[PDB]
Every structure is written in C-alpha cells, then in structure tokens.
C-alpha cells in the first residue's frame, strides 16, 4: 500500500503478469475506519490496511499477487477525513477567498476522477446510505464534457506506448463498468427487492439524462445488462471495536462482496471483456488485457499530464459565482442612478444591498463607492 506517485517512479518478480485494475471512489462519513479500506481488506482476505494508522486529494495503489488485481483508491474533499483537515487549516490559516478555495478543491477532485476513469477496468462507487444521490448525474455529465475535450492531449501523451491500437485511439483499456455499493444504515428477501429497485432507478435516471447510450463507445461507463451491479452492505459488529469488546466482555462475565466483485473480474481476467449494448445493432467494443510493465508505461505518462489547466478552467460553484456576479452587475445600475455626499452614498449603498447580493458583493460595493466618490 503506497501512493500512486511513489509507485510509478519505481517489479522484476511480477513485471510480466496479466493484471486487472479496479478503482474506488465516493463519499465517506466521519468514521474511524474508512469504508474504502474495509472493502480492500475483505476482498483480499488479509489486513492490507492496518487499524490505528494546499492539496487535499490523494491516490493510493496496492497489488495483490494471489488475485492479479491492482486496486486504486481515491480520497478527496468528499471524504470527511480530508474535509476535517481543510476546515482545521481554514480555522487557523474573506467571503471571496473561501469560495475560490472550495472551487479549487472541487476542480482538483474532478481532475483526479477524470484520470481514474482512464486507467481502470472496473470502478466502484460507495455511499453511506441506500438512497441514491442525484448529484452524480450532473457530475458525470460535467466529466464527460471535459473528457471529450482534453482527448487529443491525453492520446498524444501515450502515443509512444506499447498499450496497443485501440488503446491509443480510445485512451482507455476498454469501456469501464460501474458498480454501486450502498450501506444499510439501519434500513429494512427485502435486500434483493431493494437492490433491484435501486438498479432500475439508477438505470432510468442515467438513461434519461443521456449519460448511458446504446453504443458502449461514446458512453463514459457501462452497466451490466443481465448481471447485478448494486450491492448493499448489511450492518455488523465489525465497526466500533469498543462496542464489540464490551459485548464480548459482557458475555465473559456471565452472494458476498468477494463473489459480487469476482463475477465481474473473471470476465476481464478471461479475455472475454464486457459486451453491453441494447440499441438493436451493437458494435464491437475494444478490450485489451495488459501486463504490469505495459500498464505502468501508460499510467506514468498519463499521470504527468500543459494545456489541461486552461481546458479545465472552463468547467458546481461556477454557476453560483456567475449568478452572484450577474445579480451584482444588475443591482449596480440602480445604486448608480440614485445619488454632504455621505448621506447620498449611504442611501445608495443601502439600496444596492437591499436590491441584490451574493458571493461577489464586496467587489461591486467597492466599485460603486469609488464611482460615487469620483463624481463629487
């Protein structure tokens, strides 16, 4: 378990080995043990992550030789672990600076998510509750637009790589498969019914928003057409070790997640691939199983990638900022057409404040004050 940046720099014992990359991302509550680490610990059957152990984003990697599967974890502001640190730093060290700080964090998370979808075969989404979050519909739409725009730079970055022919054109091993993992959280066979209902709801919502199309090539990700892609984690006494220890002390004084993931990993490890298309005329989908060195050759080049900064600045707090700026600009004419001069200035300022406001009111207020003072 080492950082992704510290792993691409450096293998001979397993250089030639067919591996399958699996990515993990989502939101996590303020808990002692993150749900992402538990997933890797249970799938690998070993304590991979031990217990009690400017930029707020991180990418970790881990390779399991017994299963030939590479795991990639992503932690960002969406996780309460990093948000706590961000708030703590903000507490020690303006309405406009905080907005920009949060916007920058969101942009960094978006860039990391974009990179994760280009170097993975299967992606998992975790959530602390069974209810589906609809904000992901907008997040995915915003990610697809950015992915379809920085495509030439990404392809030119890996142009000189032994990845293959289809990989060089699509800038990805194959259309990734998205899997969902929900937590019971005391809710509620009922589990199967809830899983089917959630699958249908997610499919319909993503289909109406055009996120999922008939052709698996233009889509950012695909979902199985006959297998299950939604898993609900039931409650257990594993979490909160203090409670488990207390219960044990009191007693002394008197499918599965692995199978759910293997049903999808086996397809990639058997060169069969993923075939999902219901447009009555399916087209062949590219697929390629690389080795450790072959995959690293492309991952290292994609991780180092000049024009991405300018292309990512066009893409959310952007809508809120634009709305606030528009409101302030519209309110400015009313105050500028209202006005010794202290009384007039105060009246104009009050009228402007009562007319409109937002996240960029200080700039407009200062501009109006300067204009009023320069006219007398």
């Amino acid at each position: 378990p080492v950082s992704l940046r510290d792993l691409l720099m450096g293998e001979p014992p397993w250089r030639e080995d067919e591996i399958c990359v699996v990515g993990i991302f989502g939101k996590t509550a303020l808990r002692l043990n993150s749900e992402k680490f538990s997933l890797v610990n249970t799938v690998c059957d070993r304590q991979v992550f031990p217990l009690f152990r400017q930029d707020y984003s991180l990418l970790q990697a881990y390779y399991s030789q017994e299963s030939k599967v590479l795991y990639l974890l992503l932690t960002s502001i969406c996780d309460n672990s990093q948000l706590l640190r961000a708030c703590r730093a903000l507490q020690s060290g303006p309405h406009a600076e905080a907005h920009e700080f949060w916007k920058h964090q969101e942009k960094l998370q978006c860039l990391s998510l974009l990179y994760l979808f280009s170097v993975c075969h299967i992606l998992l989404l975790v959530h602390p509750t069974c209810s589906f979050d609809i904000t992901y519909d907008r997040v995915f739409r915003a990610l697809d637009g950015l992915r379809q725009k920085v495509l030439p730079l990404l392809k030119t970055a890996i142009k000189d790589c032994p990845v293959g022919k289809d990989w060089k054109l699509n800038c990805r091993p194959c259309p990734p498969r998205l899997l969902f993992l929900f937590q019971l959280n005391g809710a509620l066979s009922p589990k199967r019914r809830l899983q089917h209902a959630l699958e249908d709801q997610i499919y319909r919502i993503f289909r109406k928003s055009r996120v999922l199309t008939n052709q698996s090539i233009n889509c950012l990700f695909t979902v199985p057409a006959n297998q299950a892609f939604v898993y609900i984690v039931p409650g257990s006494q594993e979490e909160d070790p203090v409670g488990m220890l207390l219960d044990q002390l009191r007693s002394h004084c008197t499918f599965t997640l692995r199978e759910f993931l293997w049903q999808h990993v086996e397809l990639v490890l058997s060169k069969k691939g993923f075939d999902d298309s219901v447009g009555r005329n399916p087209q062949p989908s590219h697929f390629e199983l690389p080795t450790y060195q072959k995959w690293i050759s492309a991952a290292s080049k994609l991780y180092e990638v000049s024009k991405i900064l300018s292309s990512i600045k066009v893409l959310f707090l952007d809508i809120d900022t634009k709305f606030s700026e528009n409101r302030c600009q519209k309110a400015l004419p009313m105050a500028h057409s209202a006005y010794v001069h202290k009384n007039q200035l105060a009246q104009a300022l009050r009228v402007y404040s009562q007319h409109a406001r937002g996240p960029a009111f200080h700039k407009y207020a200062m501009q109006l004050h300067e204009d009023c003072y320069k006219f007398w």
Binding site: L30, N185, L188, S324, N326
Partner: protein, 310 residues
C-alpha cells in the same frame, strides 16, 4: 362560553402535489398574535415526518400509524420511494404551527416524473430551491435533518437557496439535527470536530445557525466544560429508536431516545418569535402573508434566472 376553538387529529395539505396553494387551513386559525412557525428540511429517508410528529402531537410510546405526519411504511422502503409530498400543515393546542415538506432532490420524485423544460432533473432541483426559499421567508425556525454527518452538498444547497429568496433583511434560525446518531458520535472529541466543521462550512451564511439551542446546557454531557468548544452551533443528536447482575442491560454510550426527543421538544417550544414583516401579524394574517409569498415565489425572477443557467 369561553370554549376552545377546535382540535386537529391529523395534518392537512397546505400545498398540493402540483405546487398548488390549498386554502383549507384558515378554518383552524384565530385572531391571536405571537404565533410560532416551525419548518423542516431533509433528504429522502432522513426521518422528517417522524421528527415533526414526535415534536408536535406524538410520543415515542405510540404507534407509527397514529402519527399526525404519515411516516414511511415497511413496503415503501422496499421500492426506494418517498412518502410525504407537497407541504403539510398542523397546529397544536399550544398554537404552534408545524410544517412538513417533501424530500429535496428526491430520486423517487424524479423517477416518478420520468414516466410522464429541458430535463426533469432541473425541474426537481428548482422545486427544492423554491420550497427552501418559501420556508426561509415564512418560518421562524428551520430544522435540517440528516442521516449521516457532513454530506458536504447540503450546505451549498442551503446557501444557494438563501441567495434566491423573494426579498433590514429577515433571516430565520437554523437547527442542525443529526438523526440515527451512534455511540461514536456522542464522544467529546468527535463533538468538537463536528462543531468546528459546521462553523467553518457556514462562515458567510447570514443565517442564525448559532447562539441558541445548545445541547451542552441540556445536561447531555454532564461534565463537559463550556470552554471545550470554541463555538457552539445549533446542533442536536437523535440516536436509533429502541441475581441483578445477570439482568444488566447492554452498554449503549448515549442517553435514551425518549429523553433526547423530550429535550429537543422542550427547546424547540422556547424558540424566539421575531417579526416576519413590518407589521404585527396574527394567526389568520400569517396565512394570507404566506399565500402571497408562495404566489410570488412561483412566478419569481431570480429563480428563473438561476434555472436558465443550468
């Protein structure tokens, strides 16, 4: 001769399913002044109906079938659907108004609209903002119900809802209610972190989210000194509903559900009652004021401007 006005056994709808005003609550209002209005906001299954019912005219010892605000059934959770729709109205014998609203950004509502201007997602997003703005301008206190701590997406929605209100600007009080709290959430170490995160996430909200409803003074943490918290925000925790040595019960690490519910109800009844507008309103006048506000919110300009940006 000095008989009581009337009594209500169940809540009535204040806003229809199609966002239509319902003029049927005036039959229970009087000409009395100094009224208190309480609102609620939350996700699909946080438990807004149960909390509103237990805070208005219900007790935990009763059955969920007698709640004034219908709760979710066992069969409804199996399909991932919502229960409350529109806006509900209810007044207790103490002359306190309680308003229950539908979930915001609900997947069930969106799915239902699918099987029926650009995309339904924008419509579902705008409806939530409209309801939030209406509640922010016609209520004295607004309670936010959450299942897990720090969604990080609810704060942005709360701040943007305030920026599109209809129109010395009035700002109601805000209460952060964490439902289904566990033992690990009742530790002082985590409590301090929760307070710090809340204070830092709404440093420029303008809402009255701090200064009152301090669970530290309600004896929730007997020996915790007040100086342990740098700033106390309006936060409350509600946990999951429920020879002599061998009969000792298990250790839970937090007070009983009934005790916490009673404390929260006691504190909500003592909330301040400022003036909504520049005129002393009565129980009957507030109805007309709210109706006018709803009519103006539906046909507003700021909301349309924000909708055109998506």
């Amino acid at each position: 001769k000095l008989l009581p006005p009337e009594r209500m056994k169940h809540s009535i709808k204040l806003v229809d399913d199609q966002m239509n005003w319902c003029d049927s609550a005036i039959e229970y209002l009087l000409d009395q002044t100094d009224v208190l209005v309480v609102g609620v906001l939350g996700l699909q299954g946080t438990g807004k109906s149960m909390v509103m019912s237990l805070l208005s005219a219900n007790t935990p010892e009763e059955d969920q079938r007698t709640y004034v605000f219908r709760a979710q059934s066992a069969e409804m959770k199996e399909r991932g659907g919502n229960q409350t729709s529109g806006i509900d109205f209810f007044i207790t014998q103490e002359r306190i108004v309680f308003l229950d609203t539908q979930p915001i950004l609900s997947p069930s509502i969106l799915d239902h609209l699918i099987n029926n201007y650009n995309l339904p997602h924008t419509y579902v997003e705008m409806q939530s903002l409209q309801i939030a703005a209406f509640l922010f301008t016609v209520c004295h206190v607004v309670i936010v119900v959450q299942d897990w701590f720090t969604d990080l997406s609810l704060y942005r929605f709360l701040q943007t809802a305030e920026m599109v209100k209809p129109s010395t600007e009035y700002y109601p009080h805000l209460v952060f209610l964490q439902n289904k709290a566990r033992r690990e959430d009742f530790c002082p170490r985590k409590l301090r972190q929760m307070h710090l995160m809340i204070d830092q996430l709404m440093a420029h909200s303008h809402l009255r989210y701090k200064g009152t409803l301090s669970m530290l003074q309600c004896n929730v943490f007997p020996g915790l000194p007040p100086d342990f918290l740098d700033s106390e925000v309006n936060l409350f925790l509600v946990p999951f509903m429920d020879p002599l040595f061998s009969l000792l019960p298990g250790y839970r690490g937090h007070p009983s559900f009934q005790s916490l519910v009673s404390k929260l109800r006691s504190q909500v009844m003592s909330m301040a009652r400022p003036q909504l507008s520049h005129t002393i309103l009565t129980e009957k006048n507030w109805f007309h004021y709210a109706a006018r506000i709803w009519d103006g919110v539906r046909k507003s300009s700021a909301l349309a401007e924000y909708s055109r940006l998506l």
